[PDB]
Design a protein around this nucleic acid. Structure first.
Ligand SMILES: [Cl-]
Ligand SMILES: [Cl-]
Ligand SMILES: [Mn+2]
Ligand SMILES: [Mn+2]
Length: 191
DNA sequence: GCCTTGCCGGGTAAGTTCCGGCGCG
DNA sequence: CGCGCCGGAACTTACCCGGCAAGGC
């Protein structure tokens, strides 16, 4: 499914560089936000926003995509109870992702929280349970990896992908045409 | 000879929840 | 009155990045 793949990709970005927020305001007012932030304006507008917009249209979500410029980064934001729960329930059921969704999610998580040099293959996150799920998926895909506490200070774990399986990881996972290619993977393929 | 990877410090790119406003039953 | 989109941004915790050296083949 094209929509489930894009969805899993976006969830990867949300988990890695954004979030899902249920806000309560003065006067019993409220808001539900789907958020992805990124320093690069181009990435948010040229790569991420069009995918989100496709999803919004497919799901008949009436809300608009907002791009807010902040001091340190751009924010892509959709204010939508419907889209919020769509992603929050998907995240709840993450262990049940099929292979396609797994790969889309890993791509997204990597763009957001991965080692972009690709000299080493690493993903940082404070959620060990999350990295452990990804570890299992990678193993099933034949990509060896380890999880260690990379930063004792702030308690951020790292998922290190064995360079023995660099080709398999990059070609089979980052470069799968089953769903949107991460920018650096698209570049490699077009050379 | 060199690759790999745990480990750790460097200079910062994300995240999180406020605010005032509007719309609508 | 009770909720849910919009637009902005202040505030908080950094961001992944990259060097080093131990191990192992
Ligand atoms: Cl990438
Ligand atoms: Cl509304
Ligand atoms: Mn990021
Ligand atoms: Mn953070």
């Amino acid at each position: 499914e094209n929509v489930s793949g894009i969805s899993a990709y976006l969830l990867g970005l949300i988990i890695g560089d954004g979030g899902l927020y249920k806000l309560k305001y003065k006067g019993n007012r409220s808001e539900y936000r789907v958020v992805i932030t990124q320093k690069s304006e181009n990435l948010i507008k040229q790569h991420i926003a069009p995918l989100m917009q496709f999803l919004i249209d497919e799901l008949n979500v009436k809300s608009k995509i907002q791009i807010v410029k902040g001091d340190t980064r751009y924010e892509l934001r959709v204010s939508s109870k419907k889209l919020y729960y769509y992603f929050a329930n998907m995240l709840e059921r993450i262990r049940l992702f099929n292979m396609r969704e797994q790969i889309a999610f890993i791509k997204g998580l990597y763009v957001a929280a991965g080692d972009k040099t690709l000299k080493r293959l690493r993903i940082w996150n404070k959620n060990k349970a999350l990295l452990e799920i990804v570890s299992r998926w990678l193993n099933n895909l034949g990509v060896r990896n380890t999880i260690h506490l990379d930063d004792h200070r702030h308690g951020v774990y790292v998922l290190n992908i064995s360079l023995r399986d660099r080709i398999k990881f990059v070609h089979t996972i980052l470069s799968s045409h089953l769903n949107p290619l991460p920018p650096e993977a698209a570049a490699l393929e077009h050379h």
